[PDB]
Write a protein that binds this ligand. Structure first.
Ligand SMILES: CCCCCCCCCCCCCCCCCC(=O)OC[C@H](COP(=O)([O-])OCC(O)COP(=O)([O-])OC[C@@H](COC(=O)CCCCCCCCCCCCCCCCC)OC(=O)CCCCCCCCCCCCCCCCC)OC(=O)CCCCCCCCCCCCCCCCC
Ligand SMILES: COC1=C(OC)C(=O)C(C/C=C(\C)CC/C=C(/C)CC/C=C(/C)CC/C=C(\C)CC/C=C(/C)CC/C=C(\C)CC/C=C(\C)CC/C=C(\C)CC/C=C(/C)CCC=C(C)C)=C(C)C1=O
Ligand SMILES: CCCCCCCCCCCCCCCCCC(=O)OC[C@H](COP(=O)([O-])OCC[N+](C)(C)C)OC(=O)CCCCCCCCCCCCCCCCC
Ligand SMILES: CCCCCCCCCCCCCCCCCC(=O)OC[C@H](COP(=O)(O)OCCN)OC(=O)CCCCCCCCCCCCCCCCC
Lengths: 171, 175, 318, 83, 40, 96, 98, 99, 115, 347
């Protein structure tokens, strides 16, 4: 019953952004604020199509955009980022609480050099919208033809013919 | 190889059950149940059921405690039975060992054991599911939904426990 | 090096239990105008070694009217559970980060009944058979109060992760928020470890020992090791649960020192209470919790579950 | 009047634990309805995004939904910051 | 009745059987004799 | 004191979560590619595995629906090394 | 259906045998009865954790809460036959005959 | 149910949990949410003895999602042939299968 | 692994202690030692007789309360729900039922340790 | 037994049954079953005699095992379909398992040795409760699952139910025992038509119910437990013993009495569905019921029995406990045949 659709080994070949969890959590809010659009459209594709085979291009786009973002932050203040991600790494929970000093030292650079602002609490949490030129997934589940309903019945209740009609009962 | 542990956890569950059901001295059936529950807590735990596993741990190792509480009170006698007293208990025990052993031998050879339902001998690690949980345990959140969606369940239970303490009062009242 | 860390957990706890048998005989004596043991080495420091050697090389008598299987298994259960119940404790970095550490350890706390019952019945003596049921009833009837107290206290912590408990306290000692609760909890702890005010199992007039009567030498000493390891373990539990401490991640040793000082203080309070108070009676012993402790605990739990809601201060789940 | 006060006094003397428990319990039910912050607790619980806010497909005429995660319009929790 | 029905005594009218062998006991305790909690 | 500190802890949790939402798309975008890599590797390898068997239609789907399902983890970590499957299944449970 | 399902189902089958095939003891039989529900508890938790049936996660404890109640009365009945009859040995348990 | 007071007097009492595509806490979907959605919306207002045959392929797809009997049997066959030919020694697993 | 390794280490350690305890010392193994003990005497013909008791009721109400304690255990997770009002009322129901069971236990003798 | 405690036991039993016939989640059905189990044990121990302890113990063991097998069926169809909704089963052995689990609670197959004994043990009011109310829940579950029940299984099980119901009552003098055996026979009667069309088993349940109250209320209005004890009551209560006789005629199903209507309806629908051999077996075996029915009638009213001298001062005392509903209880159980079409109301 069908076989496969698996894209070629060449298809799912992207430069895998190879950074550590501490670095990623240190970037976080700035990375999201400056790279939301590819991410938003990518997982809009993921939830709509319900089908990653249709969203590889979105994956390439989000990877490349995040990589560009990482290249720009490398081009500018990285020693504050270096100290920040190291300090976050020392935490066993990657807690943002015991890093605030370096946090300021980071947030200022991308503010006065790359023109970025740290998103407010809940600011990068409200559900947004994004235009995607791809068509709608008319049948995301690829459902078949739904079974026809029961034959609809109608008509006023005329009195039962000859009453109960059970054995000898006249009515 | 500790690969097969998720298998053997159930296996020690089985033969700890048989001796528990081998009709030995009541405390030895209790010991069988105790090892069975201790090894089954691992069975639920390694499947992700941390809270349910520790829950059955707690309540059940209190529950067999209380069934002991009358075993030395309302069940002992001059000569308590021994796990070797009766001759038939050994036969029951060995009949416990050889059945699932033969069946698992078949499931290791044919993987299509025909006993009752349809079963495959290819371990258990497969049946797990890939995915994630974000920052919430599914089991804990599900059992927490008792106070939001368990509208009827908690009501009917609490009523039943009240009726239970009432009946426990009445039957043991002794006029 | 994981097994090395394990051994570094067991062995020091064993020396701690060993020297607790000296600090109790010194503290009690000084509380009752006695110099205590100071003949075996300097200030009696070597005395626990001598008694341990004696009990190891004392003859372990086999109870003739007994089934040896439980006579050997019961010390195994009592001792092994007592030590493995130290596993998930929040030292500055707890050994095993079990997501349900408090529930884990509370569940294992109920298992001491599973040594008490086999010891009391297998040894097959009147004192043993009495004390088995009496002590079982004690510990099981106080386990419930321990449970509701734990739940009510935790309702302000956030979860059953026992490492985040420190994060709960941080600013203020948790007792400042649940001193009525802790006052019960501590006492119930005193009840669960079978200590002189609440022991009721020794009762050296009508129970003599209760459970450790026919046990001799080694298996006998194993139940003492379990008993005086539960002392330290539950005093440490109470110490973190209510008597919080500071913990800078760059300096783990600070919280370690504060925590061990708290544990020593609480154990000294244990010895303090036992050196003064009379011993409960079984009638009053269960009257204390059924008639008095349990209703207050229920009401306090209701208070401590309603409180986070009305203050809009529910604790963080993760 | 006098009987009720005398009975309360005797309970506060005869079984003090009972009256303390009954009191604090009776508070435990009637404060949450009276307190003006339980709605704020509901806001606390709804604020936390355990899952991803999956976006909506833009087609025009949803001014309420922000176009960008940095946009001014949309749900806000400054009350959370002040709290 | 055929054969074994002969040994099938009718139940009493109260529906309570005649109370069986007296198990009333108070479990004599010697409470001694060394028992150093008596001045010895 | 607990009221104010717990409010601050809720603030910290919403901050940490917001980081989690920020980084979720990248993890999803690496995960689907990684899982598809496992699927394709298993498919090509099992194709060579199944050339000799007279009746084994290669790459078949047991499901009649054409809709893609989340791969059952068995075929994911199949012929892979025993340590890989042991980690993939029982790592979170066994991790301390 | 993997071997874990076989093992807990097979454990239930022998619990059925042990409780239902009485040997001589009422207490040990109801002990087998409560082990029965342990087998069913584990079995139920298995599918429920397996299939991400998030709501049904509360069914086991619910299933638990009632089941112990049964034993709560069972052993409670056990004392009531015991004080009069003397033991839990069900072969004297014959007074109700006709 | 026999006397369905639930839809008569208008409230859910137990129907919240009956199936696993209902509103789960914090939108945690079940393993087979898609399959059982397909099955349920397939057989709605059709009649059990009529819907059991029209909504068949959905039903066994649902059951195979639950139990994975067929898929795990397929895996068992693959492992059998692999181990057989490896013991009798023709090819070696590619490095992705070792490390 | 890890956790299981700690449990294994502890059980083996305990078993070594009991083995040294029960094997190392030497006993003459004479008969009259086996005579049992009671404060100087032996426990006559008892220490296994059925125990005519009364606190059985306390023992069973323990279990009946333990079920409800299990029921109220999920509370810390449950407090993290959207509809806090229903959780509050229904948990309060659970504790009220706890108290009502205790009160019926109280007035109707019950938890009063039978005589 | 505190009156209020007895009332709260009444309504928890009734609510346990109500939960069974109103719930849709399978777990809730189980919950109602054990609610009823946990609630009915104390009332069976109201008298507190060793016979009552015996009966309660046997009931507890049988019903607890049956409910555990109920959860087994529950878990199996959950495992094979993941649907707690009560409907047609999707695994055969789960259906069978539920069938014997419920039957043990009903006393149909060899899982019926409990009911005569437990009826012997308890007081006659507890007997009325047991043999009337504790059937509605298992019948309701069996009605809800009639889509997929192995017809062979249900038919043979009903056949033994009626057959050993008829045979067991022949050698019994205790009115409680013969009533238990008669109830087993009626159990087979309705459960035979259970697979074919549930309206008729509902009707037979209603008729058996009304007949059973009309019966038990007459017993404890005469205060008799043995056949000789009832025979002595031919004197004091002649009207009560005459109604005794008329409802004992309604027992077997002699026309035009009420008891004939369910037999007639069941046989007519069984013949509608080509089952022609099957109905003749119960039609013949109902004479087994009619036999000890006639014996009870002869001991009660048809033949005068030797009274006792002391018995005459009973003449000076009147039954004070009214035991309401008895008149209409008799009447509905005697003359409702000209109202047979009303069965369509249940459908
Ligand atoms: C068709 C549907 C309607 C059928 C109606 C007729 C059948 C019902 C039973 C007989 C009613 C007539 C009568 O006198 O009853 C009381 C009468 C006298 O009570 P008793 O328990 O026999 O003797 C003790 C006294 O009540 C002395 O008092 P006590 O303190 O010993 O006991 C308290 C008393 C109630 O005391 C109160 O204050 C109330 O208890 C009862 O009446 C027993 C039932 C439980 C409590 C009452 C709540 C009923 C609802 O009892 C009976 O006749 C039978 C006892 C059980 C009655 C309820 C049975 C319900 C289920 C039967 C099937 C129902 C239809 C199913 C389809
Ligand atoms: C007139 O009327 C009178 C009465 O009535 C009418 C009376 O009643 C009495 C009777 C009253 C009395 C006898 C009064 C007693 C008074 C005393 C001063 C004596 C008691 C003194 C105390 C300080 C009390 C001590 C008791 C305690 C703390 C608890 C009591 C309860 C128990 C269960 C203890 C019983 C004893 C035990 C268990 C033995 C102790 C065993 C050990 C210490 C074992 C230690 C083992 C180790 C350390 C192991 C580890 C070892 C090492 C080396 C670690 C390293 C090793 C590795 C392998 C790593 C009298 C006299 C009377 O006049
Ligand atoms: C392997 C098998 C054995 C396992 C147990 C450990 C090894 C054996 C025990 C080793 C220590 C004790 C040796 C015997 C000592 C003795 O008999 O007298 C000691 C004596 C005690 O002297 P004393 O006070 O008893 O002398 C007699 C006094 N009058 C006459 C009044 C009765 O002290 C010494 O020999 C001096 C050194 C003692 C130890 C120094 C360190 C103490 C501080 C650290 C303690 C904790 C860590 C250890
Ligand atoms: C049909 C009848 C079936 C039973 C026939 C055999 C029993 C006949 C009566 C035996 C007892 C004889 C006797 O002395 O009965 C006195 C009793 C009360 O007397 P009385 O009040 O006159 O009854 C009729 C109403 N006035 O009166 C009776 O017992 C007469 C019968 C009373 C009941 C009516 C008949 C049954 C209705 C159903």
């Amino acid at each position: 019953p069908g076989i496969v659709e698996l894209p070629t080994l060449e298809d799912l070949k992207v430069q895998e952004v190879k950074v550590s969890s501490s670095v990623l959590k240190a970037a976080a809010h700035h990375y999201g604020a400056q790279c939301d659009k590819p991410n938003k459209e990518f997982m809009l594709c993921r939830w709509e199509e319900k089908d990653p085979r249709r969203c590889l291009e979105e994956g390439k786009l989000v990877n490349q955009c995040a990589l560009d973002f990482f290249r720009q932050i490398k081009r500018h203040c990285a020693e504050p980022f270096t100290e920040y991600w190291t300090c976050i790494d020392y935490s066993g929970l990657q807690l943002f609480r015991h890093c605030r000093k370096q946090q300021a030292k980071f947030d200022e650079c991308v503010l006065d050099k790359l023109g970025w602002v740290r998103p407010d609490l809940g600011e990068l949490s409200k559900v947004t919208k994004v235009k995607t030129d791809r068509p709608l997934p008319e049948n995301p589940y690829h459902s078949r033809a739904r079974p026809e309903p029961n034959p609809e019945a109608e008509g006023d209740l005329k009195p039962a013919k000859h009453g109960s009609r059970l054995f000898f009962w006249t009515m | 190889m500790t690969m097969y542990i998720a298998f053997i956890l159930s296996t020690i569950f089985v033969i700890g059950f048989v001796g528990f059901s081998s009709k030995p001295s009541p405390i030895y059936g209790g010991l069988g149940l105790i090892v069975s529950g201790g090894v089954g807590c691992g069975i639920v735990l390694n499947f992700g059921g941390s809270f349910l596993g520790l829950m059955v741990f707690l309540i059940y190792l209190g529950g067999m405690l209380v069934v002991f509480g009358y075993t030395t009170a309302m069940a002992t006698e001059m000569y308590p039975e021994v796990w070797v007293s009766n001759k038939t208990v050994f036969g029951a025990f060995v009949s416990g060992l050889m059945m699932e052993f033969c069946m698992v031998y078949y499931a290791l050879k044919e993987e299509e054991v025909e006993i009752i339902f349809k079963f495959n001998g290819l371990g258990d690690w497969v049946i797990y599911d890939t995915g994630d949980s974000g920052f919430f345990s599914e089991e804990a959140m599900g059992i927490a939904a008792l106070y939001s969606y368990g509208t009827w369940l908690v009501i009917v239970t609490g009523w039943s426990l009240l009726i239970g303490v009432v009946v426990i009062m009445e039957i043991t009242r002794g006029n | 090096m994981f097994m090395i860390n394990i051994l570094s957990l067991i062995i020091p706890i064993l020396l701690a239990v060993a020297f607790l048998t000296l600090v109790e005989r010194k503290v009690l004596g000084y509380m009752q105008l006695r110099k205590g043991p100071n003949v075996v080495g300097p200030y009696g420091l070597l005395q626990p070694i001598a008694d341990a050697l004696k009990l190891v090389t004392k003859e372990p008598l086999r109870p003739g009217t007994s089934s040896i299987s439980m006579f050997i298994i019961a010390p195994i259960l009592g001792l092994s559970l007592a030590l493995t119940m130290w596993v998930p404790l929040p030292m500055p970095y707890p050994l095993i980060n079990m997501n349900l550490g408090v529930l884990f350890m509370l569940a294992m706390s109920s298992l001491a009944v599973y040594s008490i019952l086999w010891s009391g019945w297998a040894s097959n003596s009147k004192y043993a058979l009495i004390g088995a049921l009496r002590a079982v009833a004690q510990t099981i009837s106080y386990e419930v109060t321990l449970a509701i107290i734990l739940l009510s206290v935790l309702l302000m912590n956030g979860s059953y992760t026992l490492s985040t408990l420190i994060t709960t306290q941080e600013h203020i000692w948790m007792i400042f928020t649940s001193w009525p609760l802790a006052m019960m909890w501590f006492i119930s702890t005193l009840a669960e470890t079978n200590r002189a005010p609440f022991d009721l199992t020794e009762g050296e007039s009508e129970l003599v020992s209760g459970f450790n009567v026919e046990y001799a030498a080694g298996p006998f000493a194993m139940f003492f090791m379990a008993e005086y390891a539960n002392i330290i373990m539950m005093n440490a539990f109470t110490a973190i649960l209510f008597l919080g401490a500071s913990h800078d991640p760059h300096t783990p040793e600070l919280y370690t020192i504060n925590f061990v000082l708290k544990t020593l203080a609480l154990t000294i309070t244990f010895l303090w209470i036992r050196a003064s108070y009379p011993r409960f009676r079984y009638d009053q012993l269960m009257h204390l919790l059924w008639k008095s402790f349990l209703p207050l605990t229920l009401a306090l739990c209701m208070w401590h579950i309603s409180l986070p809601i009305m203050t809009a201060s529910i604790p963080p789940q993760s | 009047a006098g009987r009720i006060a005398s009975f309360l006094k005797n309970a506060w003397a005869k079984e003090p634990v009972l009256v303390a428990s009954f009191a604090i319990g009776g508070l435990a039910i009637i404060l949450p309805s009276l307190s003006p912050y339980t709605n704020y607790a509901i806001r606390i619980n709804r604020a936390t995004p355990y899952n991803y806010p999956v976006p909506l497909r833009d087609d025009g005429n949803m001014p309420d939904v922000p176009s960008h995660p940095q946009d001014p319009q949309g749900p806000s929790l400054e009350w959370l910051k002040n709290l | 009745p055929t054969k074994e029905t002969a040994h099938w005594k009718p139940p009493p009218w109260n529906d309570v059987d005649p109370p069986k062998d007296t198990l009333v006991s108070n479990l004599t305790l010697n409470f001694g004799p060394q028992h150093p909690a008596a001045h010895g | 004191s607990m009221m104010k500190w717990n409010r601050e802890r809720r603030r910290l949790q919403i901050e940490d979560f917001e980081a989690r939402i920020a980084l979720m798309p990248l993890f999803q975008a690496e995960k689907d590619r990684r899982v598809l890599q496992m699927l394709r590797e298993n498919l090509e390898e099992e194709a060579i595995i199944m050339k000799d068997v007279p009746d084994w239609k290669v790459g078949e789907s047991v499901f009649h629906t054409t809709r893609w399902v989340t791969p059952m983890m068995g075929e994911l970590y199949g012929l892979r090394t025993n340590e890989e499957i042991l980690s993939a299944t029982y790592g979170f449970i066994w991790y301390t | 259906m993997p071997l874990v399902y076989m093992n807990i189902i097979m454990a239930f089958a022998i619990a059925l045998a042990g409780l239902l095939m009485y040997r001589s003891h009422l207490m040990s039989s109801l002990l087998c009865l409560e082990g029965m529900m342990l087998s069913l508890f584990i079995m139920s938790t298995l599918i429920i954790l397996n299939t991400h049936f998030t709501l049904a996660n509360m069914m086991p404890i619910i299933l638990l809460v009632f089941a112990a109640c049964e034993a709560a009365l069972g052993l409670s009945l056990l004392v009531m036959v015991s004080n009069t009859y003397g033991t839990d040995y069900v072969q004297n348990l014959n007074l109700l005959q006709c | 149910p026999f006397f369905d007071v639930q839809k008569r007097l208008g409230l859910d009492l137990d129907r919240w949990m009956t199936i696993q595509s209902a509103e789960q806490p914090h939108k945690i979907p079940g393993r087979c949410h898609a399959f059982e959605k397909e099955w349920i919306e397939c057989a709605h207002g059709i009649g059990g003895i009529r819907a059991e045959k029209e909504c068949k392929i959905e039903f066994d797809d649902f059951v195979e999602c639950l139990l994975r009997q067929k898929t795990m049997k397929r895996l068992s066959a693959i492992k059998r042939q692999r181990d057989k030919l490896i013991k009798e020694g023709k090819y070696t697993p590619p490095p992705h299968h070792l490390g | 692994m890890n956790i299981m390794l700690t449990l294994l280490t502890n059980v083996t350690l305990a078993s070594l202690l009991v083995l040294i305890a029960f094997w190392l010392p030497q006993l003459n193994a004479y008969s009259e030692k086996t005579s049992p003990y009671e404060c100087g005497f032996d426990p006559m013909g008892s220490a296994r007789l059925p125990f005519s008791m009364k606190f059985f009721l306390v023992a069973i109400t323990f279990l009946l309360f333990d079920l409800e304690i299990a029921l109220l255990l999920p509370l810390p997770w449950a407090s993290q729900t959207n509809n806090l009002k229903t959780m509050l009322t229904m948990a309060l129901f659970l504790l009220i039922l706890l108290a009502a069971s205790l009160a019926y236990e109280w007035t109707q003798k019950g938890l009063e340790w039978a005589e | 037994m505190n009156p209020i405690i007895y009332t709260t036991l009444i309504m928890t039993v009734m609510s346990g049954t109500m939960l069974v016939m109103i719930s849709s989640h399978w777990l809730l059905i189980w919950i109602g079953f054990e609610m009823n189990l946990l609630a009915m044990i104390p009332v069976l121990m109201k008298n507190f005699n060793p016979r009552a302890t015996e009966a309660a113990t046997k009931y507890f063991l049988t019903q607890a095992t049956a409910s555990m097998m109920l959860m087994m069926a529950i878990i199996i169809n959950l495992l094979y379909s993941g649907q707690w909704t009560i409907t047609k089963m999707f695994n055969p052995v789960a259906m069978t398992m539920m069938t014997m689990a419920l039957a043990m609670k009903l006393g149909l197959s060899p899982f019926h040795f409990w009911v005569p004994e437990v009826t012997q043990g308890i007081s006659l009011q507890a007997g009325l409760l047991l043999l009337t109310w504790q059937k509605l829940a298992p019948l309701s579950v069996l009605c809800q699952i009639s889509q997929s029940i192995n017809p062979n299984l249900m038919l043979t099980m009903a056949m033994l139910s009626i057959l050993i119901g008829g045979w067991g009552g022949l050698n019994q003098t205790q009115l409680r025992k013969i009533m238990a055996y008669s109830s087993i026979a009626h159990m087979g009667w309705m459960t035979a038509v259970l697979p074919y069309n549930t309206t008729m088993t509902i009707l037979n349940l209603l008729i058996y119910i009304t007949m059973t109250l009309a019966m038990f209320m007459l017993l404890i209005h005469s205060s008799a437990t043995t056949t000789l004890s009832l025979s002595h009551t031919w004197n004091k209560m002649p009207v009560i013993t005459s109604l005794m006789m008329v409802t004992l005629l309604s027992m077997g199903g002699l026309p035009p009495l009420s008891g004939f209507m369910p037999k007639w309806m069941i046989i007519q629908e069984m013949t509608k569905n080509e089952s022609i051999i099957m109905p003749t077996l119960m039609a013949m075996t109902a004479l087994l019921n009619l036999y000890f029915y006639m014996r009870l009638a002869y001991s009660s009213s048809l033949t005068m029995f030797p009274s006792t001298n002391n018995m005459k001062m009973k003449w000076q005392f009147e039954h004070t406990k009214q035991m309401k509903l008895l008149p209409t209880m008799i009447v509905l159980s005697t003359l409702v045949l000209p109202m047979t079409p009303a069965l369509s109301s249940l459908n």
